[PDB]
């Protein structure tokens, strides 16, 4: 094993790892693809998503050329440290994980050219911008901004090894979304400049979807059926007064505290979500019964069937049926 | 920095010709090489796709079978192998280097070829 | 596939003044067009790179622009020698290209 060892010794000899590949004759550039190993949970409150990748970089070093009977040295994790490897940070990662356990998640392996390969094992919480106008049924495009830290783009550029449309791959088991679903990749390149220099960024946008399956049975359903159980006090004797008096309190108390959980659930943006104007009209729509009632109990030989309450049994539900008739095709369908 | 291609082709409909060019100044192990065809008073047409370093290659769905590309490391060379030659054929083909943000950089002179 | 479908096939201008493409595509291509130059019994040469790259030794009239759909080439005062045909690619996924824009006096 001795023959490697001195061929290993000979390619850190006189190696200055402070320097790019060809600081003053031309451009390191550097072939980037990401392996996309679990997409993990959006979190809706911090605006933000985590991602499993292999992010892999590979990059032409005319220094590290070695004539040997093995072509492509599969070196271990040390190796990594003692050579010069581009400084790629993400431009809206917030607090991303490099992997150690129970090595060093890192791989390196010098062809008998120079070409190099440098993959690795990171967990990025990266920004997601979102604008909950039509929360729930909404669409984002969470992006993942690498680039060089302090190369800029004329000393080091980035570039996809494959086809771009083919060098963001994510794996079919790794889907930890629960609430969203992945409907596919989209890559970009760009210049971006700074106070120091113009640097060259490479953009991953991630297109998202929310599945309305939570909403639909903690918010909208149990609001449709206390709109219903508002409905049903016209429907009741006009002398029992504390009767369609406890079903209006009721359900004005129960319109209020299930608007609390709205709020609860997404973060405090300044304007209304879709599902906060479903709650508004649900609202006029079940404090209106009350007024009813009030009405009927201000205008109450036996007493007659008011005429409120039989143009009450029909109105009320046409309307919330051509309300959400209105509101789910509106949204839903575009 | 130069890439130069081989001579005009003449053979008969049905058989089979050998069709290749030359880099100099580089080595094609880096980047990829491209072909095109361009008929006359047509458009571009995309032949296919070869990866020197590792061998692999990738073609037009309407190009398969009847195309494929070769190449070899000493001669820093790629080749072309043409099958089944009709009068569709006709068109000039030129060898395209992949260039800085897959932009194809470099072109040859281009070869000609013609059935009868 | 990508479909090219830039228009139109010729225009026919005198020497001196604005003209300009376009390049549309059918599917989303990020910045990855590129434009080249067609004499008669000539190679292409590249024009442009990414979707606004001037490329080495060309002329600063030669203005483009992208987007992520839509792209255009505008020249500024062509002149005599710049009469040929121009041909927009893409290389998002595997390259196509498009038909063709001639010049004309």
């Known amino acids: 094993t001795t023959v490697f060892t001195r061929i290993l010794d000979r390619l850190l000899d006189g190696y200055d790892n402070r320097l790019r590949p060809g600081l003053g004759e031309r451009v390191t550039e550097v072939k980037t693809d990401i392996f996309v190993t679990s997409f993990g949970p959006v979190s809706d409150h911090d605006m933000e998503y985590t991602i499993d990748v292999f992010f892999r970089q590979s990059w032409k070093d005319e220094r590290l050329k070695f004539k040997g009977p093995m072509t492509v040295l599969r070196l271990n994790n040390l190796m990594a440290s003692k050579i010069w490897t581009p400084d790629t940070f993400f431009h809206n990662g917030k607090k991303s994980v490099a992997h150690n356990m129970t090595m060093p998640n890192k791989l390196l392996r010098i062809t008998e050219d120079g070409t190099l390969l440098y993959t690795m094992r990171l967990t990025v919480r990266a920004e997601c911008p979102m604008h909950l106008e039509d929360f729930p049924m909404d669409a984002h495009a969470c992006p993942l901004k690498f680039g060089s830290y302090a190369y800029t783009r004329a000393e080091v550029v980035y570039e996809w090894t494959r086809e771009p449309a083919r060098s963001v791959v994510v794996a079919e088991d790794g889907s930890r979304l629960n609430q969203y679903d992945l409907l596919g990749q989209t890559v970009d390149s760009g210049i971006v400049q700074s106070s120091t220099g113009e640097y060259v960024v490479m953009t991953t946008h991630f297109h998202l979807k929310r599945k309305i399956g939570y909403f639909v049975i903690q918010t909208y359903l149990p609001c449709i059926m206390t709109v219903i159980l508002s409905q049903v006090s016209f429907w009741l004797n006009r002398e029992s007064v504390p009767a369609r008096t406890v079903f209006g309190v009721t359900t004005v108390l129960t319109m209020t505290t299930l608007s609390i959980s709205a709020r609860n659930s997404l973060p405090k943006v300044a304007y209304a979500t879709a599902m906060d104007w479903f709650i508004a009209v649900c609202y006029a729509f079940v404090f209106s019964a009350l007024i009813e009632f009030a009405t009927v109990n201000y205008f109450t030989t036996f007493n007659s069937v008011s005429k409120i309450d039989r143009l009450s049994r029909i109105a009320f539900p046409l309307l919330f049926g051509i309300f959400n008739l209105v509101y789910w095709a509106t949204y839903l369908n575009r | 920095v130069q890439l130069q291609q081989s001579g005009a082709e003449l053979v008969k409909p049905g058989a089979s010709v050998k069709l290749s060019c030359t880099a100099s100044?580089?080595?094609?192990?880096?980047?990829?090489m491209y072909w095109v065809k361009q008929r006359p008073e047509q458009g571009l047409e995309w032949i296919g796709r070869?990866?020197?370093?590792?061998?692999?290659?990738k073609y037009d769905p309407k190009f398969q079978g009847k195309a494929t590309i070769t190449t070899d490391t000493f001669s820093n060379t790629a080749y072309l192998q043409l099958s089944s030659l009709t009068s569709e054929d006709t068109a000039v083909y030129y060898c395209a280097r992949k260039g800085l943000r897959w932009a194809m950089d470099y072109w040859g002179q281009g070869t000609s070829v013609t059935v009868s | 596939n990508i479909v090219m479908t830039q228009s139109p096939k010729s225009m026919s201008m005198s020497v001196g003044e604005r003209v300009t493409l376009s390049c549309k595509a059918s599917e989303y291509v990020g910045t990855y067009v590129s434009w080249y130059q067609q004499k008669p019994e000539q190679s292409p040469k590249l024009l442009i790179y990414g979707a606004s790259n001037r490329y080495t030794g060309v002329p600063d009239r030669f203005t483009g622009s992208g987007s992520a759909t839509d792209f255009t080439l505008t020249i500024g005062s062509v002149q005599a020698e710049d009469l040929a045909d121009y041909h927009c690619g893409q290389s998002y996924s595997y390259p196509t290209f498009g038909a063709g824009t001639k010049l004309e006096l």
């Open positions: 070869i990866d020197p370093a590792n061998g692999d290659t």
């Open positions: 100044g580089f080595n094609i192990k880096d980047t990829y």
